[PDB]
């Protein structure tokens, strides 16, 4: 049978230190999303440089990734990665208009506009709300 | 009809360059809605203290909670004319005395008004206990 | 009458989503009670350092320990007026000098005050040695 | 003579990793309790789904269980399991009010209210206090 | 040719000895340049309110921003004689009515003038959200 | 060793608001002085009622106090507070003649006239010069 | 011998009951003493404008400042007979023209007289910048 | 190979407290700059006394320092510290004329005037603009 | 318990400008009085048009009001406002004879003549004596 | 019996339409009453100058003040026959010479008459200092 796509997340700058000072966190706390095409293979993620999205997709293994389940996303990654040169994708720098990117993209013809947009929204790094995270909530939303 | 709610808040946040420090203890506030969709009522706080008044506070994220005893007490409390116009002693430091001297809710016993005042009272949250998996609710 | 005690604490905890990281070394603190039921006295710490003062710290979980030599030294120490009002040099870095220059406990010898100051002093715990079955007491 | 009831515990998310980083643990560390009606037979435990008690009792053998002794609990399990359809029990979802559950239960007439409550308190999963467990204590309490 | 800009400002600062206190909410103002190097135009404010007039405000630090829809609307707006001489109702409280009753920009539709008036309108900034990493732009 | 005396100041009506109006201040801006006998203990200050000195000494903790250093004043507070009933002192209402108060006082025999007068001058509330404070100067003098 | 000084002043204060409002900008004035103890000389102001004359103004609180270039220029300026009797054009609006047309200080070059006139000239102070820790000296 | 110079910054009086009062900051907020000659070794910085630069260089480890990268500055520190008695430097008190200090200095002959001046400008403490820092900007400039 | 009445004052044309000219004031300087039935609610005051009292009561929030204490006035406002249509009151234009207004009024039966007159005297705008105000006195009297 | 008093006055007021301008400095005058209820005596002023005579001035608002030294001096002064009939040199410019040459109060020393004349002397008030919270009494 065909190889299973695995979903993952990683967090950066998310440590909250408890000392006599109280609870210190870093305002750059962020959650990143990635995928593996096969078990053991490299985790793919949207590339970031200087804290901004470059528009490219890279392998980022040096990070600690945690498995997550989303049957809808696995279906969308299956379609996305069945296109030749998906890894070579170069979306507009900054990736500010996700709806326009999906609407004007001609690189994934096996994917609908609503579906590429849904996937681009999942791959998008999400800021951690520190006031919620101190209250033990994920604090993750767009 | 009657629905119970809570909201949580950091009363102080201290900023550093690219960093934030909060107190080991945050605050949990309690509120109620008389009907579905209608405004959440809560004990008013100004300058970090209880004013003694009751206000609508919708701009906050409230989460539903269940307490059959409290709903029975809110039913009695809100069946009095001018309950919203209540003005308890500033600071609300002696909850037992407030309930004992109150003549505004004659359909409520002293032990019952006191029980409700104790539920409406903001409570501190220990964030370290919270982050370890517990509710530092105090 | 006089009872000895210890308490243990992580001075730093680092939180991750659904995870916690502590230092390889935690801290053990020492205290005493003058009578059964009465408050546990301990060397005060503020901002992670020894202030030089002695305080009551009951909010902590204390475990009884036996040391006949220490009880004899606490007996001498506490039979002085204003022992609770003691204010040793901030940080309490030179325990030998503190004992040598102290004129507040004339019923105590220099070697004896120093021995007691060494017992009251917080001590680091190695958690890896602790979890292997030993007391990483240092 | 009659077959002996065996008591057991299992821990989940309780591993503490020692590295250069210090000591890392998982804040979901938990202890679960179970029983076997006969030697070799399946270990019974209160079912959990999405981290919450369903109110049902299930066999959970895929876990590593460690024997423990409690003569009072064995006496209570003896009474509990001598009722027909004990395995078919469906307590209120979440099992938040253990005192009320025992008070209103009409399924175990050979058990007193104080006794069913005592057993329900033993079967209840108990969180591991990580600050105590790092100090080599069980850290187990309600 | 046409360039968009923003500037941010604390409308109130409260001074204490060696300390300053600002409002949780600051203000963001919007402006435009007709040509590179030329003066930045913005809605005039006097006594903390919108006067209804448009002025040059160069003494402020302005940062470029991109909005292709707004540049198209400024192009239409500024191709009218005496656009700089515009005097909207004092306070500019009803932006929808201002656009509906305006007869000064016949090359602009009501929905378009209203869209532009909404962009030129000063907007409050939540500093707590700002310092946490977000733009409290409201 | 003996407990350390801490010195403090508090300011009332001292806020200067910067708006479009310019700089507004309150002409009642004033600096008050206090002392703590031990760390954590209550701050003592000369009592004021209706803007006038009553002649009494009170605890005033509800105010925000800032630590200050003055080795001469700590020496004088040490002498002052080593007298029984120092807290019970009741100087002439208004405390208009500080030199006469010190000269006629028989309550602090361990203190010289010049020394009690020096301390009374330090404890005395001092008006804030608003023209200097707008120029970023303390504006504090008698 | 020669000493430099400055003084600061609010030209307008607006009183309200129990309150005062000053302008965002105050004024800094500059002066010089020919000998230690002797009177501080400064450009005279009347009705808020520069009269063009030089006067002694001792009733003000002056603070010493160092400027080796200015002391050299004051030395040249004051070594002329009747320097105190100088009467520059009222208002002193064109400092460059004043220096260019002056025939009273032949030991001083035009660029040097102009440099000195620029130093003696009262300068506005931004109080908001001042209270933030800077000198709003302009 | 030769040991790597590390660059650092520290901030003093820079905390902004968010309460019901709004945002309070301290008008003495300041950023200081320092360097380490080797990993683990002490951070060197321009000494300040009574809020004014003394003209001397000191070790200041009791402070929390954050690493920063500047390849030009590392090159200048390399030249600066390859002179004997660089730590013993005593620049004019207050250090008011940085251009004159660099022009008249005969202590660093391996450094050009423009280069010593560039380094002196980097070592110089910089005030934090509180209006910018409340708008989430570094607010750091001369 | 019942909601607390708050007392307030506002001043118009009361600014005294200090310049080289001396002290300039406006001869229309006046003090107005108002009340709030509840905390946060609108401040009520006697309406003025063309500098003369109309005889009506209005809400005037656009003004800066300062709290004042008067236990006798709060008691009188309590009685006054416990009448239906108190806000709809229309006293004789100009309100020149306050004693006659109170004597002939049949709108406040829970109030005595001496008491309504006392309240009408408090609500009455009072001119500021500029010669006293320049001498730092309130200058307020009828 | 003897009571001390002061009164304050603007010697000049300049009127504009709907406006008034007073001098930065007003005047404080001093007076005394020999008995409770009786008329307040003060140094007479005519054409803004001191005439050298003493008059009753009741039409003014006087405020009581305490000065035990002055009451002792008024006691001596008023125990002389014809003290009210005193006619000091017009203008009263040299207070030290007036006291030195006076032969009308033989029960008073020169230093004492001079001290009293200095107290009775009208004193200027700085209104700007006054409005800032101080007494500009000079």
From Swiss-Prot, chains B, C, E, G, J:
Membrane topology: Peripheral membrane protein
Resulting phenotype, residue 12 to M: In strain: HM175/18f, HM175/24a and HM175/43c
Subcellular localization, as worded in the UniProt entry: Host membrane
Subunit structure: Homodimer. Homomultimer; probably interacts with membranes in a multimeric form. Seems to assemble into amyloid-like fibers.
Job description of the protein: Functions as a viroporin. Affects membrane integrity and causes an increase in membrane permeability. Involved in host intracellular membrane rearrangements probably to give rise to the viral factories. Does not disrupt calcium homeostasis or glycoprotein trafficking. Antagonizes the innate immune response of the host by suppressing IFN-beta synthesis, which it achieves by interfering with the RIG-I/IFIH1 pathway.
Domain comment as written in the entry: The C-terminus displays a membrane-penetrating ability.
This protein's name: Protein 2B
Organism from which the protein derives: Human hepatitis A virus genotype IB (isolate HM175)
Classification of source organism: Viruses, Riboviria, Orthornavirae, Pisuviricota, Pisoniviricetes
Covered residues, full protein: 838 to 975 of 2227
């Amino acid at each position: 049978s065909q190889a299973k796509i695995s979903l993952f997340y990683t967090e950066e700058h998310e440590i909250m230190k408890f000392s006599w000072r109280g609870v210190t966190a870093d305002t750059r706390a962020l959650r990143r999303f990635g995928f593996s095409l096969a078990a053991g293979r490299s985790v793919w993620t949207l590339e970031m440089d200087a804290g901004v999205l470059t528009g490219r997709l890279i392998r980022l293994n040096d990070e600690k990734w945690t498995e997550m389940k989303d049957d809808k996303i696995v279906s969308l990654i299956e379609k996305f990665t069945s296109n030749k040169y998906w890894s070579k994708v170069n979306f507009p720098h900054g990736m500010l208009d996700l709806e326009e990117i999906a609407a004007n993209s001609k690189d994934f013809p096996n994917m609908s506009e609503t579906d590429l947009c849904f996937l681009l929204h999942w791959l998008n790094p999400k800021k951690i709300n520190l006031a919620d995270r101190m209250l033990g909530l994920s604090g993750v939303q767009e």
